């Protein structure tokens, strides 16, 4: 090397898959690539292959599991400034590359990527320094490298994907059915048709089943691009794999305990349910022994290691075990519960249906105004003052009621619940309509009916059951639409488009990708065990084999721009546009905790996106002229959500406003919307009576033993109506996992690396965002401490609404907003 040359001092930080000397010698080579000096073909000049020289044991700052290595690079001649590097792993086993740092002012590369043996790769792995560039700002010597890496990530739409592949592409949901196992397990393909529109998911390419060329074959592992499944230092944090263990290992063990009549088959009283988190449930030794060693699963229950499993006490009963049964809590949960985003204003009376009466029978509501306890208000007054609301599941469920009720052990109604907003600011339920389709060719004599509030006699039991029917509709809509379709499924197309079309160098890549963490991974695992034919979802929720297809019916009406919180509130008639207020909308239910708190988070995110975007885009033309951005949005819409590609409401993305709106909505769905619908699942639903997932019979007729049971044993009437004990144990277990924050969660206002960009302005903006979120949390604390807001923020269950607190410790905390759909 040159006599007065100075080698560049480098430090490589990596984590071995599972000593360290093995990484020395000729094990791992790096080659720096210049960002500023090019060869005759305009490509950045490449340095010599350089191997790790030794272990650096001097750096006190390293995360757990991390090791640092010294490396020095020759850089003589006009090599300019390094902006990327190639790395080749000659070892048999992959390692996780954390970072390269070049000293002497400092150049940082944030890699966080598995590097497999070099022979497995068609292209040498390339990593860029942490500088951010829109394509027109890419240093000329890196332009081809930047595009070639995107081409690598896209692949060619063919081939069976392997573990170490980093290939992002789309496919339809044709991998849920198991037609090769049984024709009973065949399911319609979701996506790619007018009958069944659906967001796309990540392509896996396992090829067709033997029986159906349109259904993808089963697989032991559902591929995701390698770095979408990064791994966890502590197995307890691999919550997503628990779902797989639950379906494949734990569910069969529970099933056996029932098959062997080792525990009563049904609950017989409410106390048999409360027992689950008090003394626990006694099960055969082999069930316990099957559970205890399993990572994640072992955390779900306390045990004596012999026969007892105890579930954790759900938040909803921590103060009052009977408060869930109150009409006040039933209504309050529509605004501060697990599914707080379906209630709508009702602006005429009676409520109307759009459904065809030729098919379903007369659809006129039978609810009478005179029957309603509106605290002295007339109907005209209640409508005029915007005090009438409804939870309207009539049109949503009616088209499915006949087929659901044909199933053994499922019976449902299409319900509507009328709520009145009292002057005291709380909601009260005033009627429930339990509707069934009726046509000339009907065998069933069951009738639709209206049920009114009652505290005494059989009528109180009928009303309690009516609430349960409502909540079964609500639980199904929550799990399949509010949660699954609107978060998990709707976001995946954006994750794929982002990796395919926005370089790691791209500002919008850096802005959005933290909000994707673990999403493809949980979704893949969900396709394999949760929403698959005969999987957890179908065996625990009312619609059974019709569940995921009902979500395609609802996706027909999915509107991207209506996912924006203000647009949602206005659309549902629970708020009105109001420029004189800070959020720009006035809530019609003033103390609506999800909406009130959500507006604060929404505004914080908006401010962050509005500060970040101008750092990279000066004018609308800059957005129009970004070919990566244009390709990204064109593909996300025309391929990722392609069944809806023609809808008039898609932003065109030719303006700054559009880019802000699109990023904001993506970040909102991934972080706060998902947190709000996800982390309350066990807190509210851990008591099955409060959130029944299924109903198994219609209301009994007078003159039958079932009717007499309502009089003599209302708890048993109730328990015979809702989800059976066995699916209850399985359901509770899955919602417990899903309600748990892993200790390595990255929350809103956090990033995994302080050096994700070298752009100090972006880093500053991000710090302000985090500071704002802390300020918001103090605010939400004060709200929960405000005695005037007790009625809606705490309710008779005395459960402070903390779901939109930004921060949380690990565990089942009922608070904390992750950056992404990470569980
Ligand atoms: Fe989730």
Swiss-Prot record:
<protein>
    <recommendedName>
        <fullName>Seed linoleate 13S-lipoxygenase-1</fullName>
        <ecNumber>1.13.11.12</ecNumber>
    </recommendedName>
</protein>
<feature type="binding site">
    <location>
        <position position="674"/>
    </location>
    <ligand>
        <name>Fe cation</name>
    </ligand>
</feature>
<dbReference type="GO" id="GO:0016165">
    <property type="term" value="F:linoleate 13S-lipoxygenase activity"/>
</dbReference>
<dbReference type="InterPro" id="IPR000907">
    <property type="entry name" value="LipOase"/>
</dbReference>
<dbReference type="GO" id="GO:0016702">
    <property type="term" value="F:oxidoreductase activity, acting on single donors with incorporation of molecular oxygen, incorporation of two atoms of oxygen"/>
</dbReference>
<dbReference type="GO" id="GO:0005506">
    <property type="term" value="F:iron ion binding"/>
</dbReference>
<keyword id="KW-0963">Cytoplasm</keyword>
<dbReference type="InterPro" id="IPR036226">
    <property type="entry name" value="LipOase_C_sf"/>
</dbReference>
<comment type="subunit">
    <text>Monomer.</text>
</comment>
<dbReference type="InterPro" id="IPR020833">
    <property type="entry name" value="LipOase_Fe_BS"/>
</dbReference>
<feature type="binding site">
    <location>
        <position position="823"/>
    </location>
    <ligand>
        <name>Fe cation</name>
    </ligand>
</feature>
<comment type="similarity">
    <text>Belongs to the lipoxygenase family.</text>
</comment>
<dbReference type="Pfam" id="PF01477">
    <property type="entry name" value="PLAT"/>
</dbReference>
<dbReference type="InterPro" id="IPR042057">
    <property type="entry name" value="Lipoxy_PLAT/LH2"/>
</dbReference>
<dbReference type="GO" id="GO:0102299">
    <property type="term" value="F:linolenate 9R-lipoxygenase activity"/>
</dbReference>
<dbReference type="GO" id="GO:0019395">
    <property type="term" value="P:fatty acid oxidation"/>
</dbReference>
<feature type="binding site">
    <location>
        <position position="483"/>
    </location>
    <ligand>
        <name>Fe cation</name>
    </ligand>
</feature>
<keyword id="KW-0275">Fatty acid biosynthesis</keyword>
<keyword id="KW-0925">Oxylipin biosynthesis</keyword>
<keyword id="KW-0444">Lipid biosynthesis</keyword>
<comment type="function">
    <text>Plant lipoxygenase may be involved in a number of diverse aspects of plant physiology including growth and development, pest resistance, and senescence or responses to wounding. At pH above 8.5, only (9Z,11E,13S)-13-hydroperoxyoctadeca-9,11-dienoate is produced, but as the pH decreases, the proportion of (9S)-hydroperoxide increases linearly until at pH 6.0 it represents about 25 % of the products.</text>
</comment>
<feature type="binding site">
    <location>
        <position position="488"/>
    </location>
    <ligand>
        <name>Fe cation</name>
    </ligand>
</feature>
<dbReference type="GO" id="GO:0031408">
    <property type="term" value="P:oxylipin biosynthetic process"/>
</dbReference>
<dbReference type="Pfam" id="PF00305">
    <property type="entry name" value="Lipoxygenase"/>
</dbReference>
<keyword id="KW-0443">Lipid metabolism</keyword>
<feature type="domain" description="Lipoxygenase">
    <location>
        <begin position="132"/>
        <end position="823"/>
    </location>
</feature>
<comment type="pathway">
    <text>Lipid metabolism; oxylipin biosynthesis.</text>
</comment>
<dbReference type="GO" id="GO:0006633">
    <property type="term" value="P:fatty acid biosynthetic process"/>
</dbReference>
<keyword id="KW-0560">Oxidoreductase</keyword>
<dbReference type="InterPro" id="IPR001246">
    <property type="entry name" value="LipOase_plant"/>
</dbReference>
<dbReference type="InterPro" id="IPR013819">
    <property type="entry name" value="LipOase_C"/>
</dbReference>
<dbReference type="GO" id="GO:0034440">
    <property type="term" value="P:lipid oxidation"/>
</dbReference>
<dbReference type="InterPro" id="IPR020834">
    <property type="entry name" value="LipOase_CS"/>
</dbReference>
<feature type="region of interest" description="Disordered">
    <location>
        <begin position="196"/>
        <end position="218"/>
    </location>
</feature>
<keyword id="KW-0479">Metal-binding</keyword>
<dbReference type="InterPro" id="IPR001024">
    <property type="entry name" value="PLAT/LH2_dom"/>
</dbReference>
<keyword id="KW-0276">Fatty acid metabolism</keyword>
<dbReference type="InterPro" id="IPR036392">
    <property type="entry name" value="PLAT/LH2_dom_sf"/>
</dbReference>
<dbReference type="InterPro" id="IPR027433">
    <property type="entry name" value="Lipoxygenase_dom_3"/>
</dbReference>
<dbReference type="GO" id="GO:0005737">
    <property type="term" value="C:cytoplasm"/>
</dbReference>
<keyword id="KW-0223">Dioxygenase</keyword>
<feature type="domain" description="PLAT">
    <location>
        <begin position="16"/>
        <end position="129"/>
    </location>
</feature>
